[PDB]
Amino acid sequence: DRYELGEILGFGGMSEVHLARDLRDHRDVAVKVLRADLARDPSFYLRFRREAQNAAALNHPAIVAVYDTGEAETPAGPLPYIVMEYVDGVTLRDIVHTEGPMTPKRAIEVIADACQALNFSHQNGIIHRDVKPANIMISATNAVKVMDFGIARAIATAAVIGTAQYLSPEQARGDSVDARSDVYSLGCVLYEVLTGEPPFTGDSPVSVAYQHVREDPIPPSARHEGLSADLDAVVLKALAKNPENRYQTAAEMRADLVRVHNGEPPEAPKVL
Numbered sequence: 653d654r655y656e657l658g659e660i661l662g663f664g665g666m667s668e669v670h671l672a673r674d675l676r677d678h679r680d681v682a683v684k685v686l687r688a689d690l691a692r693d694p695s696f697y698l699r700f701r702r703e704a705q706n707a708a709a710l711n712h713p714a715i716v717a718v719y720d721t722g723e724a725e726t727p728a729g730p731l732p733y734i735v736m737e738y739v740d741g742v743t744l745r746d747i748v749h750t751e752g753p754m755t756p757k758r759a760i761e762v763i764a765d766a767c768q769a770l771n772f773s774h775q776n777g778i779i780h781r782d783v784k785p786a787n788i789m790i791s792a793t794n795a796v797k798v799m800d801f802g803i804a805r806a807i808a809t810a811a812v813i814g815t816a817q818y819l820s821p822e823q824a825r826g827d828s829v830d831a832r833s834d835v836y837s838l839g840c841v842l843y844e845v846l847t848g849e850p851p852f853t854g855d856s857p858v859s860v861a862y863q864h865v866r867e868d869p870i871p872p873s874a875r876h877e878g879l880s881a882d883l884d885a886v887v888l889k890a891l892a893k894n895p896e897n898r899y900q901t902a903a904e905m906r907a908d909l910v911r912v913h914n915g916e917p918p919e920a921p922k923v924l
C-alpha cells in the first residue's frame with residue numbers, strides 16, 4: 653500500500669529494478685528484486701538474499717542511498733527486496749556503449765566524484781569490491797552516483813564474475829583485498845571511459861584474470877587520440893599490479909586527477 657509501482661528501469665546479471673512512488677513521503681524510489689527469470693535459481697537466490705541483507709546504507713551525495721531492505725510477504729512467498737534512491741539517468745556502461753569515450757576533462761570530473769564516494773565508503777569501513785562501469789550512474793542533471801556496493805564473501809557463479817574486466821589482481825588470486833582494490837578497478841573504469849575499451853579483454857574470464865596479474869596495460873594515449881602523458885601516469889599508477897605501487901587511497905587518486913584537471917604535473921611516476 654505504501655508503494656505504487658511504475659515502470660521497470662533496468663536489469664543486470666541478477667536483478668531487475670523498478671520505479672515506484674513512495675506515497676508516505678511522496679518521493680520516487682527504485683525497487684530492486686531478483687530477475688523474474690532467475691528467481692528460482694538457488695545460486696542467484698542465495699546471492700541476492702545475502703546482498704540485500706548486507707546492503708551498504710551510506711549517506712553521501714555521490715552514493716545511491718539504500719532506504720530499506722527485507723523480505724516482502726507476497727502470495728507467491730517472501731520476496732527479497734531493496735528500496736533505494738531513484739537515479740534518473742544512465743550507467744557509465746550505457747554511455748560507453750551508446751556515446752563512446754568521454755572527453756578527458758569530463759572523464760576526470762566523473763572519476764574524481766567517484767573517488768569521493770569511495771573515500772567516504774572507505775572512511776566508514778566499507779570496501780566496494782565491484783567497481784565497474786555498470787555500477788556508476790550519471791543523472792539527467794549530471795550528478796555521479798556510485799551504487800551496488802559489494803560484500804565480503806567466503807574464501808574458496810551467480811554472475812559474481814562476469815568478464816573479469818574490472819577485477820583487481822588480488823581478487824583474481826584470492827589474496828587479501830583492501831581499499832587499493834577499489835583504486836585498481838576505478839582505474840579500469842577510467843581507462844575505459846577515456847579509450848572506449850577496458851585495459852584487458854579476452855575470450856574468457858581466465859584469460860582476462862591472467863592479463864590483470866601478468867601483463868602490462870597499453871598506455872591509454874596509445875589507444876585513443878586526444879590524451880596526454882600526465883593522464884597516462886595517473887591511469888597506469890592506479891593500474892599497478894602490486895598494490896604497493898598504486899595510489900594507497902582514493903583521496904590520493906582524486907588529488908592527482910584534480911592536478912591533471914588543473915594542468916599541474918601529477919605526483920604519479922612519469923611515463924615516457
Ligand SMILES: Nc1ncnc2c1ncn2[C@@H]1O[C@H](COP(=O)(O)OP(=O)(O)OP(O)(O)=S)[C@@H](O)[C@H]1O
Pocket residue numbers: 661662663664665666667668669682684716736737738739740741743786787799800811812
Ligand atoms: N537506483 C537506481 N535508480 C535507477 N536505476 C537503477 C538503480 N539501480 C539500478 N538501476 C538500474 O538497474 C540496472 C541493474 O541494477 P544492478 O543493481 O546493477 O543489478 P544487478 O543485476 O544486481 O547487478 P550486476 O552487477 O549486473 S550482477 C542498472 O544498470 C540500472 O539500469
